[PDB]
Design a protein around this ligand. Structure first.
Ligand SMILES: CNC(=O)[C@@H](C)[C@H]1C(=O)/C(=C(O)/C=C/C(C)=C/[C@@H](C)[C@H]2O[C@@]3(C)O[C@H](C=C[C@@]34CO4)[C@@H]2C)C(=O)N1[C@@H]1CC[C@H](O)[C@H](C)O1
Ligand SMILES: [Mg+2]
Ligand SMILES: [Zn+2]
Ligand SMILES: [Zn+2]
Lengths: 729, 105, 357, 138, 95, 105, 12, 263, 164
């Protein structure tokens, strides 16, 4: 039940703190199903999010709780429901048990309200798990909020209302995978809890009581309260999150400033201005590009990298120990026995690497020296050492090196030697050496970004701002999302965001659209109308009118049916804008893109790259002791698994040898893989497979039991698998 | 040399038990700490199952490939790598028989 | 030859294209096809970018008839209620009568939205995608422009009240909690399906692996007769089977005995191309054949194995099957994959049945 | 679907014995083997009267010729026991059994039809006939 | 796709046979020396860092480019198994 | 194109008396726009050192003969007390975008 | 069945 | 019998069962010799029997345990052959291929069905041995071991090496796999076109064969080592050759979503 | 009782060690550092001694134990192998032996084979290394052939790249 805090970004850890599991005591609900339990029960209202469940294996056995949900006296999520005596609604609330909820006729919050007065005769209510159109006089109790219905993690989604509950799940789990960017911006459109999230989570640092600011360091803000006291507020400069994301508190208050009680002194890892901010709001066109955005691919403007927009700082913690072998202690020294000083530079400190040094894959992070054999020296190695320099330190190079994949610049190091202060060194462990390395991750083609709705996708091409879709005024789009990904999945919410986003871009303003009560299609067409004047109003005064292009796309647009035929281009474009789409020129050709295309400010986050992401490529490497199949670990990647499902694939094909190889030379043919390599090395057409050790392991396993398995010849006669080791003596 | 074209499971004659085997494991002596070597005749003995080293013997009278198929005069070890150590079979001589549960149950 | 196999009399759906591909594959040659493939891929991609098709909100168009169909069916619900308030309809009758009201009303708005687009906005973004073999499901569109109407309770009994809203407008608070109820149920079934799919395909391979094309035309001519007509849709009326199943039955098969049908003499042993399986149907339409004599795995003589003439055409390639193909698995697979789709659209359907069979 | 189903009926029951006692369920074609040679090559018509048997895909495979295949899924423990006692010679045909061996697949290029095929250059064609010409002694 | 794969498919009785030919031809192309070809003169195999494919890039890309021509001969039993490797060593140098 | 804070070693460090962190400042520098007048100026190293309770703006860089700073009021840092910041920021003439990784000055 | 009891009973 | 950590050691559970048998077998012999009271001789012969079961198969009759720490069935030879996941069992779940790799996939629009974009950085490890030799054939390295250390660190590669790998991969092809390999087209061969970065460029048309979308699905990649494995791989396993599905005579290289929308 | 045999003395020793740790657990509230144990035990007890004894006291672990999340994880796939030449090593021995073998032939067999065989054939004796010819001809040809060999190998650099 207790696990690593998942702090990819605060929101994440917060959720992981409140999540509920089955798999526990064993007494309550194990792995067998209990199918009915996994489904979202009727009572899960305001008590559990209906979205909050991991599509897949453990499917209904886990979930974080809801908004107003609270554990009363004994663990019974009581959900709040306000009272309504007669046709009068109250501001009083009753946290009710699941059971009692059924005895009453409860109504939803969407019911037109005048205050205490219900407004429509036939208004919806739901008795006990059954939708029922009740009358104002029967309405006993009413729902508290649209928010209490789901979880925090979910509540953060813009127009949840217009997105398929299935994909809205993805959206909620996506945020749990958000990585803190050095540049954190809040959404152009928010729901209303971003504030409360950063606040209730402990990202940003708030002011206890009113006063003024004394000093504003990059490491501390010692404020002076009006009470005649002043306290120093340290700020976790750069700390290592469990999942390796930067947690820094950037001061937002200047020197000598009267602070209100509870005002942001510094911003948390991902906050802009006390607002939750992950990923960044980017202008986006929503059309198809060549194939760069084909099933779920994203085309990104190079310009996004020019500015340090999607960029994130990562830290991995390489550690090595000085073990005590009976052959002789493993010394940690700048001494690396066999070949160069070039590799010893950054190993400045005798033994450890110098802070601030750029480490690439294959550089020594820390040196160490263990002994050569198990118990005896080497006869052949005896001659060689003698030939050029007998007196050769027989010690082995076992030094922590930069593992393939990446490193950055060393920022901190820790060494614990013999006389331990108040630390716990394991047995045999002579001493430990930690090396914190940090690195800037600028967005790249391998990466995956995804908005809060669920549109998930990978970058497939970084286009030069030179030729990507550009609006009439020279401002170009940052990302081009494929439309096709929208009909199938059903989350128009994103298309609703983009639109409000367009208004907020020219109107230079951010908004807050609540869960289901938020913005409405007419209110947005309204803001778009205001935006048209900032967009095109300046255009009017700046001195110019309409393009041949702008007129041309209008022609095809009326033939389409987006603009009322007969009205002036100026007026036609307004109409066209209000619809959420504007004219766009190619960028590569300068011609327009026949037909208006929507564009706008959509928030998009960048997702954390798992260890698997470090694409694993393995040539040759270690092998398990009892099973002779490839195995990795520390620095050798470890082989991919060839499953039955995959076998058949080959089997279906006429891939005879290719399947043989997969079963012999590549994984178990002990004598095979060896001659295999060597053959390749000499450019020899690889040798014909010897018997696999899985086979020999078997036969013997089989012999271990009375059974005798002997292979036979053309005529029933022996043949030999175990090459020459089974005949006796 | 000849392609393996037929596999065959067949029951084990006690004489065939012994045929495959080398030596008799006669004592519960795994390995004795002081020397991580095989204790007495026990489960890991080098005569019974083989040399724990590449082409070399246990004592070292003969140490390279030239005589790859011969055994040492004072101690017994014919060599190819430690693989012979993982493929060879030893047998235990039961006092008064017992039976296979695979056939009885 | 490019004109003969193309239909420029219509908008290119994925089917027209699919077809084009096929045709080009038998007509012109394998590699020459590949060329066309990338050719299409290229211009498709390009023309797509310039077309400026984009999802917007106002593009999902709600019909003006939705309010009608709703209210009409609304008052009709009132009737059903007055009819129960009096004692006429049993507790049950009411229920089954209501659902019938919606199930019809919902289907009504659906053909309504399409008719809207069909008549007024032929080029609605959200619509061409679905029409073109591109992206879009009639039932999906309905959730955006028309409305998603009925969600079931936890157990399976559908709810009495529908989901009056579309995705275009605020799917309210509860219609959303109900959507959840079934959603969990669905995700569940999907993982079972996935399991049991592997289940099935596993089993299939175990019994089928040994099956391999190794032959000379097996001389045992015991053959199966493929039916072109089916007995009982309505009690008894003989009718032409559908165009696809029949294809499934006779495509690239080997005639056991000669058949003279519309004028052409299909010889014995001949592999019937899709073009031929298109003739026999045109003939059964006319009324000259009710069955077809054809070689098949069910009647093969090769103990362990199947022969060229009895398997047929289909290698991944369209000519005869090439000796030494691992049919056993090729088969076991084609059946194990679709299985994952086996949804259940006291009797059984879906994968559960394919297990019982 | 046919290829599969067929294998659910590769087996039938026995009611009029010859070589092995009556109540036994065995591979249909393997009886067509017995009856074929028992009435055609070796005389004495000992008709082997069988009964078409329908067994499920699971069982069809659960019980088959090669024990190798059988050891893989049902009960490795029983599959062997029997296969041992009887001294079973697993003729490798089929890909599951032949895969464990790490042997070339029976199906595919592993086709006995083409495992053997050589290539020539007209230059090496005349070269080999010259070797034949040389066979002429004195 | 690949050059005249259809034309190739057609020159064999079995699909899986063509694969064995090309492969065994590619084998010998390298073993006995890579100049063991039947079509080098005017229009032959070619790569572009220079036109150097003429020496040793892909073995079977050759085999196929030869088989596509009518000079090679693939039989079930065309020339006796061991006498083949002997006559080939005798006539083709490059080692 | 390159920066050298005197007591700072890696880019991820923080300077006492300095509110901004190294990465924030190196960022603010990218915002700095300079202008030299002739080819003779390929790589110009601008120098600046400020101490104590002062705000460091781009105008605080010591003037160089043929170079001009169009971005004077840009904000580099906020120094508190005992705030010691002495750096050397390189500047070059190039084309397009070049990741700090690509050049490695 | 289970081994301790049988011997115990056996010599006891 | 192995050396773990601290001097922890690790031995196959089989050895505790073997000692069982040996000690009892021995104790038996000494018990006969010493003199033999019936009850005690059987008593032991009982234990002996039971022991003989232990190694063969544990649990058919009672279940042996290592001393207080893990009430676990010491894997019996039978458990070895069968087990939860044992010998023929995971034999068939899979083994690990030596020349394999796996990264995130990304759409390769310009790529032709024929090829696929493969990270050079990946290619290097994958075709390491093929490169080493190719290095010696050129001036880049004197010998193998040289060529090896020449590449053991990232900063030491001369740009001449990429030209060697790009030359090694000339007409070879690899295989790509998807998450659930459901049908034979779940593995396809293409010609690698070495590219920068981490991602693997896949063709769009074959995205339908492999059930693969780009929100993070990762594809593995294998290497055909024999000239034969390569022969088959590129002749009968490559992509552009298998256009029509084995299930239906219907194409599978059908213009998927974007292409249609355009056309 | 144990998998790795331990003499009766070591046994009582371990019991004493154990018993002692018991009396020491009695009051500290601190599982004794190996300081107490040495003291309380007696005459010749030290930290190295107790750390050793308790290292031998830990019985082995099961190479086959339920691992990670207890699903289907068997402990022995993780342990690598040492004697077996990972490909990299097989390739080494190939060039090394072919190149070492090329040099061994181009030389005088007299003192080259002596040191090749004395060092590479049996065991690691200047005097006892050469047949009849004494030390002065040994050092003579050993150091003059070993350097001509090294210096021409310096010219045609084949060995320089340390095969190790
Ligand atoms: C083969 N099964 C059938 O079709 C029939 C026979 C029968 C059956 O055997 C069933 C099952 O064996 C399934 C059990 C479940 C739900 C197991 C959990 C542990 C699963 O939960 C999840 C979370 O994880 C896993 C896989 C999927 C899951 C569900 O999401 C996991 C396996 C079953 O559903 N049937 C229904 C019953 C009602 C009724 O009688 C109807 C006719 O047939
Ligand atoms: Mg996916
Ligand atoms: Zn010896
Ligand atoms: Zn047949």
């Amino acid at each position: 039940l207790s696990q690593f805090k998942d702090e990819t970004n605060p929101l994440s850890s917060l959720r992981h703190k409140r999540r509920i599991s089955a798999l526990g005591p064993g007494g309550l609900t194990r792995e067998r199903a209990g199918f009915d339990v996994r489904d979202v029960h009727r009572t899960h209202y305001g008590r559990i999010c209906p979205v909050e469940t991991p599509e897949g294996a453990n499917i209904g056995l886990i979930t974080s709780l809801a908004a107003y949900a609270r554990v009363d006296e004994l663990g019974f999520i009581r959900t709040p429901y306000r009272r309504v005596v007669g046709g009068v609604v109250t501001d009083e609330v009753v946290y009710m048990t699941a059971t009692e909820e059924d005895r009453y006729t409860i109504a939803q919050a969407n019911t037109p309200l005048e205050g205490n007065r219900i407004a429509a005769e036939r208004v919806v209510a739901r008795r006990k798990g059954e939708p029922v159109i009740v009358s104002p006089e029967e309405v006993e109790f009413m729902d508290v909020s649209p928010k209490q219905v789901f979880s925090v993690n979910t509540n953060l989604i813009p127009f949840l209302e217009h997105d398929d509950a299935n994909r809205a799940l993805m959206g909620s789990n996506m945020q749990t995978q958000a990585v803190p960017l050095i540049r954190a911006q809040a959404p152009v459109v928010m729901t209303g809890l971003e504030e409360r999230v950063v606040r209730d989570s402990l990202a940003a640092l708030y002011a206890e009581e009113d006063g003024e600011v004394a000093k504003v360091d990059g490491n501390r803000i010692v404020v002076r309260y009006e009470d005649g006291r002043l306290v120093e507020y340290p700020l976790r400069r750069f700390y290592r999150s469990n999942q390796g994301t930067a947690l820094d508190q950037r001061p937002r208050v200047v020197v000598g400033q009267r602070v209100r009680k509870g005002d942001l002194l510094a911003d948390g890892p991902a906050s802009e201005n006390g607002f939750l901010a992950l990923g960044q709001n980017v202008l986006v066109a929503i059309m198809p590009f060549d194939g760069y955005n084909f099933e779920d691919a994203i085309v990104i403007s190079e310009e996004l990298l020019k500015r340090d927009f999607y960029t994130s700082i990562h830290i991995e913690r390489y550690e090595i120990e000085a073990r005590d072998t009976k052959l002789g202690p493993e010394r940690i020294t700048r001494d690396i026995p066999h070949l160069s000083e070039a590799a010893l530079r950054d190993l400045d400190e005798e033994g450890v690497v110098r802070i601030g040094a750029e480490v690439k894959p294959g550089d020594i992070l820390v040196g160490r020296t263990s002994f050569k054999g198990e118990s005896e020296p080497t006869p052949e190695e005896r001659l060689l050492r003698s030939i050029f320099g007998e007196k050769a330190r027989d010690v082995k190079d076992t030094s922590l090196r930069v593992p393939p994949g990446e490193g950055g610049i060393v920022v901190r190091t820790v060494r614990l030697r013999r006389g331990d202060p108040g630390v716990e060194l394991k047995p045999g462990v002579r001493e430990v050496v930690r090396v914190y390395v940090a690195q800037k991750r600028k967005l790249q083609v391998g990466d995956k970004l995804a908005n809060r709705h669920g549109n998930k996708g990978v970058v497939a091409k970084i286009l030069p701002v030179e030729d990507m879709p550009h609006l009439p005024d020279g401002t170009p789009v940052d990302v081009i999302l494929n439309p096709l990904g929208v009909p199938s999945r059903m989350n128009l919410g994103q298309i609703l965001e983009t639109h409000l986003g367009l208004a907020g871009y020219f109107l230079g303003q951010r908004y807050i659209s609540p869960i289901f009560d938020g913005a409405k299609e007419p209110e947005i067409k309204e803001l778009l109308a205001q935006a048209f004047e900032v967009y095109f109003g300046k255009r009017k005064g700046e001195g110019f009118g309409v393009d041949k292009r702008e007129v041309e796309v209008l022609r095809r647009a009326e033939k389409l049916g987006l603009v009322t035929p007969g009205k002036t281009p100026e007026e036609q474009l307004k109409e066209l804008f209000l619809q959420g789409k504007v004219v766009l020129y190619d960028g590569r050709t300068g011609e327009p893109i026949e037909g208006p295309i929507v564009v706008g400010q959509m928030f998009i986050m960048k997702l954390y790259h798992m260890v698997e992401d470090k694409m694993h490529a393995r040539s040759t490497g270690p092998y398990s002791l009892i099973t002779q199949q490839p195995l990795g670990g520390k620095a050798q990647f470890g082989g991919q698994r060839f499953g039955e499902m995959e076998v058949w694939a080959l089997e279906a094909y006429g891939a005879a040898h290719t399947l043989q190889e997969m079963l012999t030379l590549k994984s178990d043919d002990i004598e095979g893989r060896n001659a295999a390599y060597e053959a390749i090395i000499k450019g020899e057409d690889v040798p014909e497979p010897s018997v696999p050790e899985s086979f020999r392991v078997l036969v013997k396993e089989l012999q271990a039991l009375a059974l005798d398995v002997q292979t036979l010849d053309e005529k029933d006669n022996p043949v030999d698998i175990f090459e020459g080791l089974a005949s006796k003596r | 040399k000849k392609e393996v074209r037929k596999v065959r499971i067949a029951l084990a004659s006690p004489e065939k038990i012994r045929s495959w085997s080398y030596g008799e494991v006669e004592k519960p002596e795994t390995i004795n700490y002081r020397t991580l070597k095989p204790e007495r005749d026990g489960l890991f003995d080098e005569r019974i199952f083989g040399p724990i080293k590449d082409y070399e013997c246990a004592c070292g009278k003969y140490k390279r490939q030239r005589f790859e198929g011969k055994v040492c005069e004072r101690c017994g070890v014919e060599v190819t790598k430690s693989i012979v150590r993982r493929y060879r079979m030893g047998h235990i001589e039961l006092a008064t028989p017992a039976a296979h549960i695979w056939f009885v149950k | 030859v490019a004109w003969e196999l193309i239909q420029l009399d219509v908008p290119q759906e994925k089917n027209s294209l699919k077809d084009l591909v096929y045709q080009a594959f038998l007509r012109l040659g394998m590699e020459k096809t590949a060329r066309l493939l990338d050719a299409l891929k290229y211009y498709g991609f390009t023309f797509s970018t310039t077309s400026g098709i984009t999802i917007g909100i106002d593009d999902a168009v709600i019909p003006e008839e939705k309010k009608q169909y709703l209210e009409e069916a609304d008052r009709k619900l009132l009737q059903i209620e007055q009819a129960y308030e009096m004692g006429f309809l049993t507790d049950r009758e009411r229920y089954d009568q209501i659902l019938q009201l919606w199930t019809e009303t919902t289907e009504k708005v659906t053909q309504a939205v399409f008719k809207n687009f069909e008549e007024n906005y032929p080029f609605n973004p959200l619509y061409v995608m679905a029409q073109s073999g591109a992206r879009g499901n009639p039932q999906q569109i309905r959730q955006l422009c028309g409305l998603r109407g009925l969600m079931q309770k936890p157990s399976g009994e559908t709810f009495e009240v529908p989901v009056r809203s579309s995705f275009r407008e605020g799917l309210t608070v509860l219609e959303y909690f109900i959507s959840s109820h079934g959603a969990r149920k669905g995700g569940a079934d999907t993982a079972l399906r996935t399991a049991d799919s592997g289940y099935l395909t596993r089993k299939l391979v175990d019994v089928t692996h040994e099956i391999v094309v190794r032959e000379a035309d097996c001389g045992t001519t015991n053959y199966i007769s493929v039916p072109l007509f089916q007995p009982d849709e309505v009690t008894r009326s003989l009718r032409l089977r559908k165009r696809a199943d029949i294809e499934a039955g006779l495509y690239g098969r080997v005639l056991a005995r000669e058949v003279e049908v519309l004028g052409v003499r299909l010889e014995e042993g001949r592999y019937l191309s899709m073009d031929d399986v298109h003739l026999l149907i045109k003939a059964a339409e006319a009324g000259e054949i009710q069955e077809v004599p054809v070689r098949s795995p069910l009647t093969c003589q090769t103990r362990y194995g199947v022969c060229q003439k009895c398997y047929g055409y289909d290698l991944s390639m369209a000519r005869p099957v090439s000796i030494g193909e691992a049919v056993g698995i090729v088969a076991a697979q084609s059946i194990g994959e679709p299985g994952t789709q086996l949804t259940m659209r006291d009797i059984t359907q879906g994968l559960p049945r394919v297990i019982e069979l | 679907i046919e290829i599969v189903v067929r294998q659910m009926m590769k087996y039938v029951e026995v009611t009029d014995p010859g070589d092995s006692r009556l109540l036994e369920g065995q591979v249909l074609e393997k009886w067509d083997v017995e009856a074929l040679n028992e009435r055609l090559i070796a005389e004495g018509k000992t008709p082997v009267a069988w009964k078409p048997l329908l067994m499920g895909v699971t069982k069809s495979a659960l019980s088959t010729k090669s024990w190798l295949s059988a050891a893989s899924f049902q009960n490795t423990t029983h599959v062997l026991t029997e296969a041992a006692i009887a001294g079973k010679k697993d003729e490798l045909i089929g890909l599951k059994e032949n895969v464990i061996l790490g042997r070339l697949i029976p199906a595919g290029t592993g086709s006995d039809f083409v495992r053997f095929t050589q290539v020539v250059d007209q230059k090496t064609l005349k070269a080999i006939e010259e070797a034949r010409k040389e066979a002429v002694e004195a | 796709a690949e050059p005249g794969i259809d034309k190739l498919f057609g020159m064999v009785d079995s699909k899986y046979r063509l694969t064995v030919v090309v492969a065994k031809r590619a084998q010998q192309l390298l073993r006995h020396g890579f100049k063991n070809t039947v079509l080098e003169p005017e229009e032959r195999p070619k790569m572009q860092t220079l036109e150097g494919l003429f020496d040793d890039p892909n073995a079977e890309t050759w085999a196929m480019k030869e088989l596509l021509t009518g000079r090679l001969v693939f039989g079930e039993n065309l020339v006796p198994e061991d006498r083949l490797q002997k006559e080939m060593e005798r006539i083709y140098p490059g080692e | 194109t390159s920066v050298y804070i005197e007591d700072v070693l890696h880019e991820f460090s923080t300077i006492p008396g300095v509110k901004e962190d190294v990465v924030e400042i190196i960022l603010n520098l990218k915002e700095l726009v300079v202008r030299f007048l002739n080819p003779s100026l390929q790589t110009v190293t601008l120098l600046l050192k400020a101490e104590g309770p002062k705000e460091v703006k781009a105008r605080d860089f010591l003037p160089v003969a043929d170079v001009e700073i169009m971005n004077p009021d840009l904000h580099i840092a906020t120094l508190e007390e005992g705030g010691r910041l002495n750096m050397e920021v390189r500047v070059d003439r190039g084309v397009g975008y070049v990741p700090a990784e690509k050049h490695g000055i | 069945k289970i081994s301790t009891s049988d011997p115990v009973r056996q010599y006891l | 019998m192995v050396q773990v950590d601290g001097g922890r050691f690790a031995t196959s559970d089989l050895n505790d069962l073997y000692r069982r048998l040996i000690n009892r077998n021995n104790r038996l012999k000494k018990l006969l010799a010493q003199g033999a009271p019936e009850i005690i001789i059987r008593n032991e012969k009982r234990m002996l029997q039971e022991a003989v079961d232990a190694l063969l198969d544990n649990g058919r009759r009672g279940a042996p345990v290592t001393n207080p720490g893990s009430d676990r069935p010491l894997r019996s030879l039978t458990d070895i052959l069968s087990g939860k996941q044992g010998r023929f069992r995971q034999n068939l779940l899979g083994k690990r291929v030596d020349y394999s790799g796996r990264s995130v996939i990304v759409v390769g629009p310009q790529l032709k069905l024929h090829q696929c974009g493969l990270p050079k950085r990946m290619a290097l490890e994958l075709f390491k041995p093929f490169l080493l030799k190719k290095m010696e054939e050129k001036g880049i390295a004197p010998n193998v071991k040289a060529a090896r250390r020449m590449l053991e660190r990232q900063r030491d590669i001369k740009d001449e090496v990429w030209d060697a790998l790009e030359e090694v991969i000339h007409g070879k092809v690899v295989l790509l796999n998807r998450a659930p390999t459901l049908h034979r087209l779940g593995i396809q061969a293409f010609q690698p076109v070495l590219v920068e970065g981490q991602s693997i460029q896949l063709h769009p048309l074959v995205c339908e064969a492999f059930n693969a979308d780009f929100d993070g699905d990762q594809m593995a990649v294998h290497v055909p080592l024999s000239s034969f494995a390569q022969a088959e791989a590129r002749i009968q396993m490559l992509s552009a050759h298998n256009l029509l599905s084995p299930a239906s005579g219907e194409p599978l290289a059908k213009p998927s979503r974007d292409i249609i929308l355009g056309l | 009782a144990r998998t790795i045999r331990i003499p009766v003395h070591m046994v009582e020793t371990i019991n004493k060690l154990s018993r002692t740790a018991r009396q020491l657990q009695q009051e500290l509230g601190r599982e004794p550092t190996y300081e107490e144990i040495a003291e309380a035990m007696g005459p010749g007890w030290d930290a190295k001694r107790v750390e050793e004894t308790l290292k031998i006291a830990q019985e082995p672990v099961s190479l086959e134990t339920p691992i990670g999340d207890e699903k289907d994880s068997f402990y022995g796939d993780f342990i690598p192998d040492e004697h077996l030449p990972s490909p990299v090593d097989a390739a080494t021995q190939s060039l090394l032996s072919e190149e070492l073998e090329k040099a061994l032939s181009k030389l005088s067999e007299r003192e080259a084979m002596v040191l090749k065989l004395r060092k590479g054939l049996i065991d690691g004796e200047e005097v006892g290394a050469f047949f009849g010819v004494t030390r002065e001809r040994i050092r003579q040809i050993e150091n003059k052939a070993l350097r001509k060999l090294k210096y021409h190998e310096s010219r045609t650099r084949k060995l320089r790249d340390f095969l190790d």
